[PDB]
Short mmCIF file of C-alpha atoms in Angstrom, two decimals:
data_model
loop_
_atom_site.label_atom_id
_atom_site.label_comp_id
_atom_site.label_asym_id
_atom_site.label_seq_id
_atom_site.Cartn_x
_atom_site.Cartn_y
_atom_site.Cartn_z
CA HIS A 627 116.41 123.79 91.13
CA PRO A 628 119.14 126.41 91.25
CA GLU A 629 121.26 124.79 88.45
CA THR A 630 118.35 125.19 86.10
CA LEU A 631 117.89 128.84 86.94
CA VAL A 632 121.83 129.02 86.10
CA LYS A 633 121.07 127.45 82.79
CA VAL A 634 118.09 129.86 82.16
CA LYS A 635 120.51 132.94 82.69
CA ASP A 636 123.07 131.25 80.52
CA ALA A 637 120.40 130.78 77.84
CA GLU A 638 119.73 134.77 77.97
CA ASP A 639 123.54 135.22 77.62
CA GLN A 640 123.71 132.82 74.55
CA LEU A 641 120.54 134.23 72.90
CA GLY A 642 121.07 138.03 73.75
CA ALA A 643 117.33 137.93 74.67
CA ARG A 644 115.07 137.73 77.89
CA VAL A 645 113.97 134.33 78.74
CA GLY A 646 110.87 133.69 80.95
CA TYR A 647 110.64 130.45 82.79
CA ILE A 648 108.41 128.71 85.32
CA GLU A 649 107.87 125.26 86.82
CA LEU A 650 104.52 124.46 88.65
CA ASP A 651 103.70 121.31 90.63
CA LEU A 652 100.84 119.96 88.63
CA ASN A 653 98.96 118.67 91.60
CA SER A 654 99.45 121.71 94.11
CA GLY A 655 99.89 124.44 91.53
CA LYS A 656 103.06 125.54 93.62
CA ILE A 657 105.79 127.47 91.83
CA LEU A 658 108.96 125.25 92.01
CA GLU A 659 111.38 127.54 90.05
CA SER A 660 110.79 130.80 87.97
CA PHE A 661 112.58 133.59 86.19
CA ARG A 662 110.99 136.72 84.97
CA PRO A 663 107.55 135.11 85.91
CA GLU A 664 105.44 138.27 85.54
CA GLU A 665 107.25 139.69 82.48
CA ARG A 666 105.18 139.70 79.13
CA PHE A 667 106.22 137.56 76.26
CA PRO A 668 104.50 136.97 72.80
CA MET A 669 102.50 133.66 73.21
CA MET A 670 102.98 132.81 69.38
CA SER A 671 101.41 129.26 68.48
CA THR A 672 101.16 128.49 72.24
CA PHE A 673 97.78 130.18 72.38
CA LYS A 674 96.47 127.32 70.12
CA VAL A 675 96.03 125.06 73.27
CA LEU A 676 94.04 128.00 75.02
CA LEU A 677 91.83 128.19 71.77
CA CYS A 678 91.13 124.35 71.75
CA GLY A 679 90.37 124.72 75.54
CA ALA A 680 87.77 127.58 74.65
CA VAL A 681 86.44 125.10 71.96
CA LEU A 682 86.25 122.20 74.38
CA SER A 683 84.35 124.46 76.92
CA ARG A 684 81.82 125.13 74.28
CA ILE A 685 81.41 121.34 73.45
CA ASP A 686 80.92 120.77 77.22
CA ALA A 687 78.24 123.55 77.35
CA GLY A 688 76.28 122.04 74.23
CA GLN A 689 77.37 124.89 71.95
CA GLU A 690 79.85 123.12 69.66
CA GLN A 691 80.35 119.52 68.38
CA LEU A 692 83.80 117.81 67.49
CA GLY A 693 81.93 116.23 64.51
CA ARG A 694 80.83 119.48 62.82
CA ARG A 695 82.32 119.89 59.41
CA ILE A 696 83.65 123.38 58.26
CA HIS A 697 84.22 124.13 54.56
CA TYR A 698 86.58 127.07 53.75
CA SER A 699 88.26 128.62 50.57
CA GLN A 700 91.77 129.35 49.10
CA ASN A 701 91.60 132.75 50.47
CA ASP A 702 91.25 131.51 54.08
CA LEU A 703 94.85 129.84 53.93
CA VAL A 704 97.75 131.74 55.51
CA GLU A 705 101.37 130.77 55.70
CA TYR A 706 102.13 127.49 57.42
CA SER A 707 98.87 125.57 56.92
CA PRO A 708 100.28 122.03 56.25
CA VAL A 709 96.98 120.29 57.11
CA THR A 710 94.31 122.91 56.20
CA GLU A 711 95.82 123.41 52.72
CA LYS A 712 95.02 119.68 51.79
CA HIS A 713 91.17 119.86 52.60
CA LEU A 714 89.91 122.68 50.39
CA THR A 715 87.39 120.40 48.75
CA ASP A 716 86.19 118.20 51.70
CA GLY A 717 86.65 120.67 54.61
CA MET A 718 87.55 119.62 58.21
CA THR A 719 85.75 118.68 61.40
CA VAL A 720 86.30 120.86 64.50
CA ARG A 721 88.13 117.66 65.96
CA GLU A 722 90.58 117.73 62.90
CA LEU A 723 91.07 121.51 63.17
CA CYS A 724 92.16 121.23 66.90
CA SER A 725 94.30 118.26 66.12
CA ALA A 726 95.94 120.37 63.22
CA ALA A 727 96.29 123.60 65.38
CA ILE A 728 97.99 121.70 68.37
CA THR A 729 99.86 118.80 66.73
CA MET A 730 100.98 120.67 63.52
CA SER A 731 100.65 124.23 64.69
CA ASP A 732 98.43 124.74 61.50
CA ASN A 733 97.81 128.62 61.33
CA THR A 734 94.60 128.34 59.07
CA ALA A 735 93.12 125.86 61.51
CA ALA A 736 93.68 128.33 64.37
CA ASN A 737 91.97 131.21 62.35
CA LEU A 738 88.99 128.91 61.47
CA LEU A 739 88.66 127.86 65.22
CA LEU A 740 88.86 131.59 66.25
CA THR A 741 86.01 132.21 63.80
CA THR A 742 83.89 129.48 65.67
CA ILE A 743 84.17 131.34 69.02
CA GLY A 744 83.82 134.92 67.61
CA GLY A 745 87.58 135.79 67.19
CA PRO A 746 90.44 136.87 69.51
CA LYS A 747 88.43 139.06 71.96
CA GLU A 748 86.26 136.02 72.67
CA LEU A 749 89.35 133.95 73.52
CA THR A 750 90.45 136.87 75.82
CA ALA A 751 86.81 136.78 77.34
CA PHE A 752 87.13 133.06 77.91
CA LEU A 753 90.48 133.52 79.74
CA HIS A 754 89.17 136.59 81.83
CA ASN A 755 86.10 134.37 82.93
CA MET A 756 88.39 131.51 84.17
CA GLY A 757 90.46 134.06 86.29
CA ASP A 758 93.44 134.87 83.85
CA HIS A 759 93.47 138.66 83.65
CA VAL A 760 96.87 138.80 81.95
CA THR A 761 96.83 136.51 78.82
CA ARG A 762 95.16 138.41 75.87
CA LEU A 763 94.79 137.56 72.21
CA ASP A 764 94.23 140.59 69.86
CA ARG A 765 95.10 139.44 66.35
CA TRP A 766 94.75 136.57 63.95
CA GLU A 767 97.33 134.38 62.40
CA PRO A 768 99.83 135.42 61.22
CA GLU A 769 100.00 138.99 62.63
CA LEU A 770 99.81 137.83 66.24
CA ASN A 771 103.53 136.51 65.84
CA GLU A 772 104.84 140.30 65.24
CA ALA A 773 106.46 140.36 68.66
CA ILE A 774 107.00 144.15 68.49
CA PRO A 775 109.04 145.08 71.66
CA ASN A 776 106.83 146.41 74.55
CA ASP A 777 103.72 145.61 72.45
CA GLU A 778 101.26 143.83 74.98
CA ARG A 779 99.11 142.43 72.18
CA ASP A 780 99.16 138.56 71.79
CA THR A 781 101.12 138.25 75.01
CA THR A 782 101.13 136.22 78.33
CA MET A 783 103.38 135.99 81.44
CA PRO A 784 105.09 132.67 82.19
CA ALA A 785 103.08 132.46 85.61
CA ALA A 786 99.71 133.30 83.92
CA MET A 787 100.28 130.85 81.17
CA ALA A 788 101.36 128.13 83.59
CA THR A 789 98.33 128.63 85.97
CA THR A 790 95.91 128.73 83.02
CA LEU A 791 97.45 125.37 81.50
CA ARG A 792 97.00 123.76 84.84
CA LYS A 793 93.44 124.86 85.21
CA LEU A 794 92.67 123.49 81.60
CA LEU A 795 94.37 120.15 82.23
CA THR A 796 93.34 119.40 85.89
CA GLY A 797 90.48 121.71 86.90
CA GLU A 798 86.70 121.30 86.88
CA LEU A 799 86.79 124.05 84.11
CA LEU A 800 86.57 121.20 81.39
CA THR A 801 84.90 117.80 81.68
CA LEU A 802 87.20 114.77 82.27
CA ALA A 803 86.59 113.71 78.56
CA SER A 804 87.47 117.18 77.38
CA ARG A 805 90.65 117.55 79.69
CA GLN A 806 91.77 114.16 78.38
CA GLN A 807 91.25 115.17 74.71
CA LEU A 808 93.24 118.43 75.33
CA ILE A 809 96.16 116.56 76.85
CA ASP A 810 95.95 113.89 74.09
CA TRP A 811 96.43 116.55 71.28
CA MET A 812 99.33 118.04 73.22
CA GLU A 813 100.98 114.60 73.65
CA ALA A 814 100.60 113.96 69.84
CA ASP A 815 102.45 117.33 69.15
CA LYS A 816 104.61 116.70 65.95
CA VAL A 817 106.51 119.95 65.56
CA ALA A 818 108.30 120.32 68.91
CA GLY A 819 110.98 117.57 68.43
CA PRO A 820 114.11 119.90 68.89
CA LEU A 821 112.79 121.49 72.19
CA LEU A 822 112.07 119.77 75.50
CA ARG A 823 111.35 116.46 73.76
CA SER A 824 115.01 116.13 72.72
CA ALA A 825 116.05 116.04 76.29
CA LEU A 826 113.20 113.94 77.51
CA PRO A 827 114.19 110.28 78.22
CA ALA A 828 112.26 107.18 77.17
CA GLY A 829 109.47 106.53 79.83
CA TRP A 830 108.83 110.11 80.53
CA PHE A 831 105.31 111.59 79.67
CA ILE A 832 105.28 115.06 77.64
CA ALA A 833 102.27 116.86 76.20
CA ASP A 834 103.49 120.31 74.91
CA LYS A 835 102.77 123.02 72.30
CA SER A 836 105.66 125.04 70.83
CA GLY A 837 105.78 128.55 69.46
CA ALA A 838 107.83 130.56 66.92
CA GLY A 839 107.39 134.21 65.90
CA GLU A 840 109.24 137.22 64.51
CA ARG A 841 112.32 138.85 66.28
CA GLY A 842 113.51 135.50 67.53
CA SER A 843 110.33 134.71 69.40
CA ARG A 844 110.35 130.98 70.61
CA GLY A 845 108.44 129.18 73.32
CA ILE A 846 106.94 125.93 74.77
CA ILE A 847 104.32 125.05 77.21
CA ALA A 848 104.61 121.44 78.61
CA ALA A 849 102.97 119.06 81.20
CA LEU A 850 105.57 116.39 81.69
CA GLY A 851 106.85 113.88 84.17
CA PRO A 852 108.54 110.44 84.75
CA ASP A 853 107.03 107.03 84.94
CA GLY A 854 104.65 107.77 81.92
CA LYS A 855 102.54 110.49 83.79
CA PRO A 856 102.70 114.30 83.83
CA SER A 857 103.64 115.80 87.28
CA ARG A 858 104.78 119.45 86.27
CA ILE A 859 104.04 122.28 84.08
CA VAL A 860 106.97 124.05 82.32
CA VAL A 861 106.70 127.52 80.46
CA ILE A 862 109.63 128.87 78.50
CA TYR A 863 109.45 132.05 76.44
CA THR A 864 112.06 134.04 74.64
CA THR A 865 111.84 137.11 72.29
CA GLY A 866 114.31 139.64 70.95
CA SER A 867 117.21 137.15 69.91
CA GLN A 868 118.92 137.42 66.43
CA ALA A 869 120.19 133.81 67.06
CA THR A 870 119.32 131.09 64.43
CA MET A 871 116.27 128.79 64.89
CA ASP A 872 118.74 125.94 65.58
CA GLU A 873 120.46 128.00 68.41
CA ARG A 874 117.06 129.21 69.99
CA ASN A 875 115.93 125.21 69.88
CA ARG A 876 119.26 124.29 71.45
CA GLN A 877 118.89 126.75 74.39
CA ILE A 878 115.41 125.45 75.16
CA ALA A 879 116.56 121.82 74.92
CA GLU A 880 119.50 122.65 77.34
CA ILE A 881 117.04 124.14 79.89
CA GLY A 882 115.09 120.88 79.34
CA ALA A 883 118.21 118.71 80.04
CA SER A 884 118.85 120.71 83.24
CA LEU A 885 115.14 120.40 84.49
CA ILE A 886 115.24 116.64 83.85
CA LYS A 887 118.68 116.21 85.41
CA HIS A 888 117.77 118.06 88.69
CA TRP A 889 114.08 116.72 88.66
#
């Protein structure tokens, strides 16, 4: 809706940073609204959805099991590992690592899952093979969040990320059981409270994944809609702002309030 595009441009003014935005129809894949849809932004933790999509693909192909238990050590732990730091002695299943990567944005969980598939270049190969020639992961947690201006490492475009999420959640790319598990993890997201969720009324469905990185990098990818069912994909990225985490959260929430108002 044009009023949401007015709020996105307002967000750019308030953050002194570029904001990338796209709304897709979840059913048709048609673009409903966009701003800087083909400009590159750091993915930050939004890649953790794509990573668990790669993992589910392997499970579907008989190359991985949700139930396989992975043991790791003190020196695997990176910054912001709220689940993985508690399981040094017992390890975690692939299921638990995907839950921790998507629902809690656990960085060590993402690194351990990247190791299962052969690292960032294999996630990029997975994305290439499903027809996304833009989205690329180059680095591990936490360096992938560096958000150096004009650096194309660890980036996507709003339009590419939206299309890729739609193909993961509704395509034939994953089995019905894998699609359902990926959206169930995103629906259980615990760390996106101050973003689209804070504008979302009771009765609406949202499955999302947030991102934060350096240089004011902030983003969210979501499948949402009224009446307890997703019907649209929303992707919001920003990078370059000096604004506080609270101000970046408020701008994304206000884009959310406008998207809901003008649904």
